[PDB]
A paper describes a structure:
The core of the glideosome consists of an atypical class XIV myosin A (PfMyoA) and a divergent actin (PfAct1). PfMyoA is a critical molecule in the parasite life-cycle because it powers the fast motility (~2 µm.s−1) required during motile sporozoite stages, and is essential for providing the force (up to 40 pN) needed for non-motile merozoites to invade erythrocytes. Here, we present the X-ray structures of full-length (FL) PfMyoA complexed to [name] and MTIP in two states of the motor cycle.
We determined the crystal structures of FL PfMyoA with two light chains bound (PfMyoA/[name]/MTIP-Δn) in the post-rigor (PfMyoA•FL-PR) and in the pre-powerstroke (PfMyoA•FL-PPS) states at 2.5 Å and 3.9 Å resolution, respectively. Major differences are located at the ELC/converter interface when the PR and the PPS are compared, predominantly due to a sharp kink in the pliant region observed in the PR structures that promotes contacts between the ELC and the motor domain. SAXS experiments demonstrate that this ‘folded-back’ position of the lever arm is not primarily populated in solution and is selected by crystal contacts. In PfMyoA, W777 is sandwiched between the α5*, α5’* and α6 helices, thus interacting with the hydrophobic core of the [name] C-lobe. These interactions between W777 and the α5* and α5’* helices are not present in the folded-back PR structure that displays a much larger kink at the pliant region and thus moves W777 away.
Residue numbers in the entry:
A (entry chain E): 2 to 79, 82 to 134
B (entry chain B): 28 to 158
C (entry chain A): 2 to 370, 378 to 631, 634 to 818
The structure:
Amino acid sequence: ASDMEEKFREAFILFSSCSDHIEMYKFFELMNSFGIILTNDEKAALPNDINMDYWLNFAKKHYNYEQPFKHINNVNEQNVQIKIDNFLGIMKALDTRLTESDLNILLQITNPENKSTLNLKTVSQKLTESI
Amino acid sequence: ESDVRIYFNEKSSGGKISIDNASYNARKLGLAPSSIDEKKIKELYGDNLTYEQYLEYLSICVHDKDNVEELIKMFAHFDNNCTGYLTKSQMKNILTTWGDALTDQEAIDALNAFSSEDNIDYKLFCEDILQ
Amino acid sequence: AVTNEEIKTASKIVRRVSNVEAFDKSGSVFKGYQIWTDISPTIENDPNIMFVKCVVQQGSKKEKLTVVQIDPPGTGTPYDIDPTHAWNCNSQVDPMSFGDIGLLNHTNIPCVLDFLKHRYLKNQIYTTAVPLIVAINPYKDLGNTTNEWIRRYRDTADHTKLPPHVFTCAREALSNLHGVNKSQTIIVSGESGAGKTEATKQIMRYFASSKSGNMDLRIQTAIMAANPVLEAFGNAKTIRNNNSSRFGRFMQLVISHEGGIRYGSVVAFLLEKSRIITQDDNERSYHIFYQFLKGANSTMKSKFGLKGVTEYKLLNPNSTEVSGVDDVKDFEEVIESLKNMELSESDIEVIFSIVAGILTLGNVRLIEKAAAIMDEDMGVFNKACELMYLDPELIKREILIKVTVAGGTKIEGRWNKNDAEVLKSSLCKAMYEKLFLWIIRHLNSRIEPEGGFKTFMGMLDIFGFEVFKNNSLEQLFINITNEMLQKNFVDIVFERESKLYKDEGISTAELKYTSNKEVINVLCEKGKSVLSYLEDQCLAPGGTDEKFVSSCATNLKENNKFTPAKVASNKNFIIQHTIGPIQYCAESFLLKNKDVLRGDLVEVIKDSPNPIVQQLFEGQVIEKIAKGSLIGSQFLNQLTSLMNLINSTEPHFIRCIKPNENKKPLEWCEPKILIQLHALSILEALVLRQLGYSYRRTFEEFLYQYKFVDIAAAEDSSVENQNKCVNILKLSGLSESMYKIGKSMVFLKQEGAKILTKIQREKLVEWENCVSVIEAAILKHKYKQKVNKNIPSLLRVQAHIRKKMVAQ
Ligand SMILES: Nc1ncnc2c1ncn2[C@@H]1O[C@H](COP(=O)(O)OP(=O)(O)O)[C@@H](O)[C@H]1O
Ligand SMILES: [Mg+2]
């Protein structure tokens, strides 16, 4: 037994600026912060005005308790290592909201050393510890 | 000074006062203690204070540094458009999630006592509770 | 505060250039798709709001969108907007993460305004739109211009790691000067109350901060001391500004590479003389009058026979006091500042004797006898002249005796009350303006380099384009100055771009230039201009304001730049200025242009026993009026000299914005801010920078950025970096028009760069989920960190709530 409700509540209000309703773009950020990924069809079937209670139910149903951050690295497959500047290249190419500071922080955490490559199993492990 | 001894004697058991009763006396005395002040005197003299330790505690509970500017910081943080206002739900979510979190009834009550309207001037709310 | 004329102007500045992509391939709205609209009940009800944030609803048609307002909070009501009323949104963007407006994906008007707004609200008042620096008045001390901030901006290793600031401009300008031995000019522009004088003073304080001393401290202090002195004598409390500069100011400075002002020169031009005589309600005259009368000691008061602030015809008796302005404390600062300008106690006494004299003369009453001084005021007249070191009998004769030249004979006559009141007023105004100029002239003799400036730092602190209800001659002179400054701006942007392309071997024929040569000519050109015709009418024997307007319409038909008025076609004209059409009122234009002290009165002042009073009109020349004596004629001469000097320098541009008309912090009036964004060419600067080969990055910079467009071509050890780039670009799908390969850089058109960003993103589709989840997980951590910083404060709120509970 490992209830994530209190964490799902706090996360909603960090993204909704403490109001009980959240905008669509910010709901996407919130679900993604818990590793939840939706298809475009699942996105379209969502209510237009998402409230706290709707999210608390959606998170219980969609959150992977066994493997959060399965979309960074899946333990069921194996094929998990990229060069630091290539990873920073991809992060920037996909237009991250993440600043130079944020990225540098992520880098020294998930790569305590200065090893030429970054491990995505280590990224998913570090991010799970931080939940 | 007189009320300090009057309130102590009302809750005193075997010449010593408990931390919960010492904090209650400070509230009765117009002081506003937090878990931090409670943990300070716990670190020094445990959960049962003498009259000397109780007086030293009321000295920690004098937070002269408290004003509208200081208290509004968390509310101001969530007022993204700088209106000087937050809804009752925004403020209830703040008051019940972080810090020495209040119960949902305690928060709802404090807000409902202040205003009848959904949008609260958080500078005026903080000014009111400081009195 | 918001006029309907402001609403009409602001709506004319809005344009829809970027088409909204709200639908997918399937023709379905992107879930949660956000737009900006100018259609909302929030806009009808709040004149401050021009745009609102909406989400396009599932089921919208491409012909008419169905939207719901989300920001400011609304009703949840769906309504329909035409697509010409929807603008792109920069959703999920931190306005504090970068300093230039142009780094935004969408630079439409609602997007620019929002970026500036959210930065302004976080007390980040400086933002660039290269080469311009935008500075929004916070109407509060942010504490960002202290010595700790000067040392920070000056001593920081990598200058590019500092956010935008006026100190960044001061640092860049000083680096280029010493770096390439080239003179620079910092041009500070904006409307009254925008923060120009503050930005100017801030930059001077930056310059006056030396890493390890200034042996020329005596000169620097004299220069720094000019600020209180120039403000006292040339600034006044108007309705729009408690400390409004009523003159244009230019300075040349000699500053060491380490900081420290060594030499300087001050120029003050176009001083509002009319203020000395009358002021509108809720408006004062120059601070000096109030500082002097309120602050002068008993001994000084008895010496000059001073009466109170409410006891002078020249001063409004009802606007004597200003909120947060201590004229007594300011007078003490002014005396100290004059002393630091190396003026003796004797010099300072002459300065204030003349001020006392000007004030006393204003109290002398004239009556109709022909005019005469009231006998009751004959001592008041004598005291005034004694105080101004002028001959009482000779000054009286110039105010009351008229010399007419009928036929070819001089005929002595008398001025009537009205005519004599004008001469007395003219003497008051002339004595003041020349004293103000003498203090500057004296300062310059102490601070200037003996053999002229080799390399200098210029500073211009000037009113921007002015568009009032009634635009007179002063507005015409201001708008003419701003046309010369706009030419300077478009010229340097072009020169800089044209050189870059040339240095890299790219075609300069593709480049665009919008000249204002047409409007400069219609306003200044010798023989064919508003100023040439104003001069001819002033010099003509039967010259009128109506004949001036008529001669303008008759001879300026070659350009649309001159347009005759519709409502009262005579006495009114309209000019097609760069920022749009400005309508002037030619009423009193000839009277205003001729408002310069006449020959014979000047010769009495020159004949004074006092050396300072003898110097006020030094080599003025005796005289009806000659071309070189008219305000506009002297103005165009000075303007050309000033412009030739600036055109020789590397220019820097600070554009100041007044965010509201209430002098309040955190108050944002979009219609007013938009009129300013337009008038200050902030919007044009974005346009200009986006044109042509907008993107330029070194071969290595392009290769790191656009690596995954074609990772094979990018990661090929055999091919050179110049060759790899042509391989990535030829394979991408970009037309050859969209890019050019230079000597050291890849040149891309704005459109080409955006497509190339989108190509690279398609090639890394397998990372989208991974990148989303990492980014969002970090943002959640970052948001909690911002809550953690404020938890000590929250504990205080909670503590007080629980104390108030016990109280019950
Ligand atoms: N950077 C600033 N920080 C704080 N207050 C400012 C700033 N700039 C201007 N102000 C305020 O606005 C007023 C008007 O600004 P001012 O520099 O005189 O503008 P301008 O010369 O364009 O008329 C000031 O007297 C001051 O109260
Ligand atoms: Mg000024």
